[PDB]
Symmetry: none
Subunit: 170 residues, 2 copies
Amino acid sequence: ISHMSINIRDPLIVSRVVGDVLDPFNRSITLKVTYGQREVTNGLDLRPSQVQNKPRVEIGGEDLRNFYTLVMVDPDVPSPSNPHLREYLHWLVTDIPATTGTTFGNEIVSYENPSPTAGIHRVVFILFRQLGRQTVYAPGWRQNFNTREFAEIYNLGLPVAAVFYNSQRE
Amino acid sequence: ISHMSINIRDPLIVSRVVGDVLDPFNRSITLKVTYGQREVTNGLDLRPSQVQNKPRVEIGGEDLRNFYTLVMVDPDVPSPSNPHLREYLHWLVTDIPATTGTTFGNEIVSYENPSPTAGIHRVVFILFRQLGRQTVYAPGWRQNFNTREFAEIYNLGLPVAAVFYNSQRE
């Protein structure tokens, strides 16, 4: 979107997920990420002890023929005040068929549970439409990941969905 | 069906359409609902701007002599987190001859376009076989509709088909 179309009160802008991690975009696809009995909605708190295992993830889709990639990052590493490891890639699942979820995709970076030690961390899930199956691949390491660059490299365009939770040391 | 015959990975169970709205059932009849150039398949996203007009609806059938009823509900009203208006009846078409579609039936509750304002809403189409033509009639209001009770009142048994899309505010 153009900056003339941005809603500056959107929770992704207030939280600076759009800004620090993502360019402005219009949500268009369902992304349902569940830990326990809570679906991630922007700004919900989940403690480290609640996110030790991968969440359930269900997605929508625009066309049955589509495949989606799910990115999970913590931008606030090692801390939000000095985030020199931004972004830390916690999980990467490609080739998710439209309308299914991560158990139907290819987990190309395994789920590492977030365990913040300093400050309140945003933990962000981002969904992208792929140009086709078997077109998106993993970085060589988890730290200093750049979702914007990743999307550029893999022709992913703007995200179709994103949502985040907050987490801090217990 | 018995709970010993349920496929717990069925998309209608994962999405809780079976659970929140419907009892478990085996699909037996074709239900093709089209908005624009997309047929509704479970979990597809359609934005409010894409569903302003009634969809095209074509049905199958078990016997030419049969008549079917189409129910369209949003269970996630006013929001999925606090769905105290569940279900909102968006459309009701009775007396659809087997193998035809809604233009051949009796629209007894007019199509109200879904326009969610909070959360992601499931918008569900449910098809039932009638005991006969001219046996199924409309409620007095749209809110707090109960498809299970409706089916009991009108001898509709279990659904023969159901499908849903996801929609959220634009």
